[PDB]
């Protein structure tokens, strides 16, 4: 259950900018960060983990200053470097604890990795324009920011993640049984097995005589359950669809055609 803090900063031009974010603990979204809001919004009753209010507000203040400072620094790099608008930057930062925890802080420009926080400073990723190599020299001057990031990844994060793991331990281990139904798709007669409403995410779906089934992508539902589709291409009887899920206490779902 790693913690993934995502950031989406869009710079249409020098006058229009948006930054939005959210936090993922495993497959669950714990926080939403709207550019139309001063503060980060908690989605779950346990979203605050074990951190106290004074603690949580401290982090809250850091994000305010960081959002404001981040966007102005980008604009100044645009001038100095100098880069053409529109610009789009993405940040992926967080950690996951183990029985030694690991942390990360990557930034992408135009959908490509440009740099990550490594050790105590900023470093260019392998695929990075020469200008990124220059923007680093400027960033590495800011010793304080360099310590805050170091402390946020190595100290703050692992603690906050441990707090979330226990505060929301029951909803993380929660089980939700999926409902299933069959249908006849567009003829290549291809049989379709639908499986929606299951949580957690891991699932098993196959057409039974095991067959050469083609499982689709695990799509999300609005309520945080998942949807899946398994199709089999056969000539137009005894065929079955089997569903194995943790919510199914050994009681596999079985639907005959």
């Amino acid at each position, epitope marked *: 259950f790693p913690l993934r803090c995502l950031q989406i900063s869009s710079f249409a031009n020098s006058s229009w900018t948006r930054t939005d974010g959210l936090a993922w603990l495993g497959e669950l979204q714990t926080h939403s960060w709207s550019n139309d809001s001063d503060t980060v919004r908690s989605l779950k009753p346990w979203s605050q983990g074990t951190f106290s209010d004074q603690q949580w507000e401290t982090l809250q203040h850091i994000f305010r200053v960081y959002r404001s400072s981040f966007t*102005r620094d980008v604009k100044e790099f645009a001038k100095m470097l100098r880069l053409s608008y529109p610009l789009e930057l993405q940040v992926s930062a967080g950690c996951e604890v183990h029985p030694a925890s690991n942390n990360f802080f990557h930034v992408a420009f135009q959908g490509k990795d440009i740099l990550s926080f490594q050790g105590t400073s900023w470093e260019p990723t392998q695929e990075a324009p020469l200008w990124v190599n220059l923007a680093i020299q400027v960033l590495n*001057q800011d*010793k*304080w920011t360099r310590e805050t990031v170091q402390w946020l990844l190595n100290g703050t994060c692992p603690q906050f993640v441990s707090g979330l793991l226990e505060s929301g331990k029951s909803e993380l281990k929660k089980q939700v049984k999926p409902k299933a139904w069959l249908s006849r798709g567009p003829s290549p007669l291809l049989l379709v097995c639908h499986v929606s409403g299951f949580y957690p995410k891991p699932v098993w779906v196959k057409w039974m005589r095991q067959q050469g089934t083609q499982p689709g992508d695990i799509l999300p539902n609005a309520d945080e359950t998942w949807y899946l589709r398994a199709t089999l291409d056969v000539v137009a009887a005894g065929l079955s669809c089997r569903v194995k899920h943790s919510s199914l206490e050994g009681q596999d779902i079985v639907l005959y055609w």
Partner: T-cell receptor
Amino acid sequence: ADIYQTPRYLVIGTGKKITLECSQTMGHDKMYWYQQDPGMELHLIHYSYGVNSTEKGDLSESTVSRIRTEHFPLTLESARPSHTSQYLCASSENSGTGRIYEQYFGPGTRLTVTE
Amino acid sequence: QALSIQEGENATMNCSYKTSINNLQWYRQNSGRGLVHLILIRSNEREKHSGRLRVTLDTSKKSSSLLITASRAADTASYFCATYDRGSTLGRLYFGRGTQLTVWP
């Protein structure tokens, strides 16, 4: 040191083209222009990261050029009485040379625009 | 702002900012001249000394004071407080109004 400005003083007619000179022999990539009312709050009107860098500040009708490190000339397309004030030129040390936070100023230009 | 004191007396000037700052610095100006940097205090510092002047920084109340001991005619000038909001060269120096200090005989 140091940084130099000419002219110290100047009185000109409304609507004339003015060019305020600022030079610096310290090798500072970063330079700034300020508009000041006597003893009043300073307003950054232009700044530069280096050669070819010409950025507008939080403040009027004027432009700058940075063809060379040493020179950061300010031009007043037209002159209205509103342009009556002090014009300060400043620079800041390069990273790796000295502390980058302070700004070094010139003598300034006391400009009066009369009707 | 304006402050008038007598030679030998101590002068104290107040300054306050709003946002987060990396460091705070005081300047002085004289008639027909440009600003001269006097002293710099970082956000993680509370007091700094140099010659006859001392700066104090209260990040909590977000304000600073400049003390000049043994005021001397030479101290007569305009004093400005300016904040710097970055730990790099992308920083912005923000100046305050500036108070006229005159040391009389």
